[PDB]
Design a protein around this ligand. Sequence first.
Ligand SMILES: [Zn+2]
Ligand SMILES: [Zn+2]
Ligand SMILES: [Zn+2]
Ligand SMILES: [Zn+2]
Lengths: 313, 311, 310, 310
Amino acid sequence: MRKDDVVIVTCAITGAIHTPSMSPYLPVTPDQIVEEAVKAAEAGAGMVHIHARDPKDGRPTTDVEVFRYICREIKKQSDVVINVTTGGGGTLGIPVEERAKVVPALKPEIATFNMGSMNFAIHPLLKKYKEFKYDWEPEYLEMTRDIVFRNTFKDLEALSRIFKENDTKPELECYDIGQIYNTAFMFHEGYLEPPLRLQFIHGILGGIGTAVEDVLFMKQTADRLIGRENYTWSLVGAGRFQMPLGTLAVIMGGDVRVGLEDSLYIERGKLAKSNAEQVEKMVRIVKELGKRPATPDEVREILGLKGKERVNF
Amino acid sequence: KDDVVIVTCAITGAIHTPSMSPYLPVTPDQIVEEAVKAAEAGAGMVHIHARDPKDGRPTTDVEVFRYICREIKKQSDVVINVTTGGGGTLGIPVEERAKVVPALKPEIATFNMGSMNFAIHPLLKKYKEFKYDWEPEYLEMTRDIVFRNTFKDLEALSRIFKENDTKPELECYDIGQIYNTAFMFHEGYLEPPLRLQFIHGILGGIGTAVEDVLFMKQTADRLIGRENYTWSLVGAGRFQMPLGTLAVIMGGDVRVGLEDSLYIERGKLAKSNAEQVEKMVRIVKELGKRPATPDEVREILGLKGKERVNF
Amino acid sequence: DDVVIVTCAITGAIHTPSMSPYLPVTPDQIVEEAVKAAEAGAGMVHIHARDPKDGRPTTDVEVFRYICREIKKQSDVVINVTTGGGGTLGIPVEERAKVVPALKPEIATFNMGSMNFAIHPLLKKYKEFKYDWEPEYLEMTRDIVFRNTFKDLEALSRIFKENDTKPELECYDIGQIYNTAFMFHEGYLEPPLRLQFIHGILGGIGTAVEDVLFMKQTADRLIGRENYTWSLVGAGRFQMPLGTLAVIMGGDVRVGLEDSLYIERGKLAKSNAEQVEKMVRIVKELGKRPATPDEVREILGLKGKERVNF
Amino acid sequence: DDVVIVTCAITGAIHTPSMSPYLPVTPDQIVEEAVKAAEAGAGMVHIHARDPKDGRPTTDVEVFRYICREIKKQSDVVINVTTGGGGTLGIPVEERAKVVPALKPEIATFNMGSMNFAIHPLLKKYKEFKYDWEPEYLEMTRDIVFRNTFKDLEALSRIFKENDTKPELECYDIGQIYNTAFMFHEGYLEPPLRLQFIHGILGGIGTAVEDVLFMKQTADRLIGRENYTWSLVGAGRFQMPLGTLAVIMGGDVRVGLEDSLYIERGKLAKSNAEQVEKMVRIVKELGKRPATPDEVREILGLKGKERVNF
Ligand SMILES: [Zn+2]
Ligand SMILES: [Zn+2]
Ligand SMILES: [Zn+2]
Ligand SMILES: [Zn+2]
């Protein structure tokens, strides 16, 4: 049972979708990711969501030593909840058993747990960006035209066990209705321990879109398959749907995720200068609606997390 | 008129295995006989997979397809809808599975609209004894096989279908795949009017709630346009007749068959594909409608004719 | 969940005699049609009274008494008495409710809000009427509220309890489900509730699949799936499609000449039984079966045929 | 698709004077609050009249005349005049409509069905009233129909047209959207239509996100996306979240002490402007801005401030 006026704001710092040449404010190096996470926390993000990128050229990497560095350095400066991706790399065809290695290495409090195999395509960005600092960038974007983001039921069974072994909470990423169905199945099969934490992700080419209809239907599907008393949820709107759909989520009693991982913009046609800028905006809206951002320790109590110092970094 | 319903019958598929029902058609001759029976019962279109004649194992073998399609056409003017999905749950990619279309040049063929989990390993808790070793191996392997249909695959497939004058039947198992369909349509790969099929109840896809069906259809109206497509629905298993009837109430078309359910009623095996067709036709008729003849299927879906297929 | 309650609504107050020679008008016609409906598989029949002389709707509790007495002599069917009939003539709940103490039925209708309820467009479809009352009645629905205020509802809730009569809570709109939830949460309506969704009335919600799903979802969300069961009425040509929909969704269904005069497009239904026979064929194709009257009593927790006051 | 019409409903007929010292009740109070709302970014203000001495709701056209004249002297704000006010005292449309011929406003409310409209539960929250009329009024609404029959609406449509006043079509339920669809198709209502969805009245549709979306979808499906525009009213604590939802969905929004006495839970709004300022802040965070009164006129096709009869 949680307070009806406290909203968890998550800030997704860099991701794997956007590339350096798309915005000079996309955090690329590990130290940039660290500083932007700490700034996001100080702006009201009770949780930060972390991917690694190669410092030399910003290319996505699964390297757990880069994760280890980033997470340790954030923890030195902040009590923010550090949520680690196990999805990062998937758009480069990297399997779950390799993506998942960050969980036993770092034993984070919470990490992402993607709930189905899907197309996950950003090749259309090649129409929008013509020149790139690095050769890897347009190659990466093109290759997503034929790469499956793979998360089979066999993968998910093994992942559920890995999370339990390292006392890591799954944040169950759902990009379509079928993936909520997948979530219900794994829950009812005993693999996922309640209360579940779901995140609804809207606007991926290969997933569900960004209509108000889509958001409502996702949440109602979770209510009816899983049961309201058995889960909490957050939402991501891609790109310019970040603030409108995030606001919808809050109105519906959900939590919200913002961050340069999901959108490079602060307004129509205006690049966000930092993660903190989007966090400050969403906090202003949360407060107009008579709510407030959760502190990191509130996030821990709300999601039942193990504690900032019970991690392996 | 809004009083004609296309009733499609999916004869064997690739999900059910022989040991699950002695009435699942296995051999090429069984599949032919059953298709022709389904047609005579009011299925204006039949949907065909191939199986290894020896043991029923799904196969892409084009020469089995050719034999089956040739033999159906010799007995019936039924519209023959060929799979390019069969083999997908064994990890065979679109490039291989699509070769039936340039070979046979069918009037219509299936065209799966996204990559997904497609899992039937739970069937192992229901069936313990199998005539063939391949059957439980296959069920188990689906726990870890992606039914792969990437945007690259789909661009290639769109061209293959156009090059052979084969209409795509766009199989959508989830809301995301209707979004994928809208993308491919707007990009210019898929020619309108589109033919969609909503498939409910696959582990890895959307479920079988009335909510699910309505939302799929509303998503197509909203992204594609109510005028720019027609649609059919498949309800897996015991949801076959109720969801098929729902589709009819909603102005859609319906698909039945042993590919999709082994049963005629809770606990009772269907003895043929024709039995399920006869039932659905009775339901259609009580709702004031009638099944489409094959030639009405051709008119409604803009198909080339049986004279122009390569069998 | 393989039993469906099929109700047959025998005559109502909306259709008038000159619209169809098959609409039951006299008390004896209504009785006989109710009995045939029951024999066709309707476990419950729904009754309105009409004037024997010209078929004008009437609330006369003594006409109700004759009709219900005579049905019960011939059949164990559950007899559902209207407390809505007369409402489209401007007659308020206080008068319409008098049937409940008079007859103490097992179940009676209980309408869940005030609304416009207009059938004046029927004057565009029928230009010749045997009786002067028919077109005057139709025209006056243009300016008559079907009145069921919260005061009315509170009084009615008590009247039903005093007579051990189960409410069948008639909802014609989403607002009326909200009213139901209110009356339930306030303590006036004893669960489990029986609701009926009425689709197609001008002044009410329409006949889209969307409308039906949204009504049922609204009740699930406000009242709770565990706290109610439901039936559906589709008006006119929507009778069979929406009824079939309701069965697919796990609801019960109501048919009858009260709700539609037709058996198919352009063809008058020759009797209530014709409609029940057809809905029963559909129910059976969907692997279900009609509830017998005693199954209806068990499902809805009804007091039994011997405990009524007729 | 970046301009949002923010309407402020200054006083209404639901809340009573003793519920908040900040509810405007005298004519001059109403004028002053209307101007402050306009200055805060309300391009339109919605006006009811109240008795100058006891604050009771009143239809008196000469009170409306003074109020609207005095507002227009100070502000070019668009003045929306109620034809619903008095309905909860049982006053019928024919009487409530007289303000339209008298004042020929640019825009006026046009309520789209008969309904329960009950505020007796306010007696649980407010125990002391300065006037006897206040608790009496609230209790009586338990048993008063808010009457708006099809005959009424036919008459009202001619009145609006005769005075070159745009109908703002108030829908409190799904059936009322169906009613709007009918009156449109019958030729009574001139497109493009202006609808307003009212959420939270006891007797109407509630305040769920589901309710809002289903109202808007029904209007799209029945009337056509291109044939209407819409505004939304969330009652009470739902004012801001539902108004924000409306903005997200492309709709316009109404605030004001008519609909909520509060600026935040447990904190009384000290003025209409306080609610307007808040909504306007929310609009701007969502990358939009409030309409000026002249933009309201252009967006809705209003005749202009110089063409009213005050
Ligand atoms: Zn991520
Ligand atoms: Zn198939
Ligand atoms: Zn009745
Ligand atoms: Zn008002």
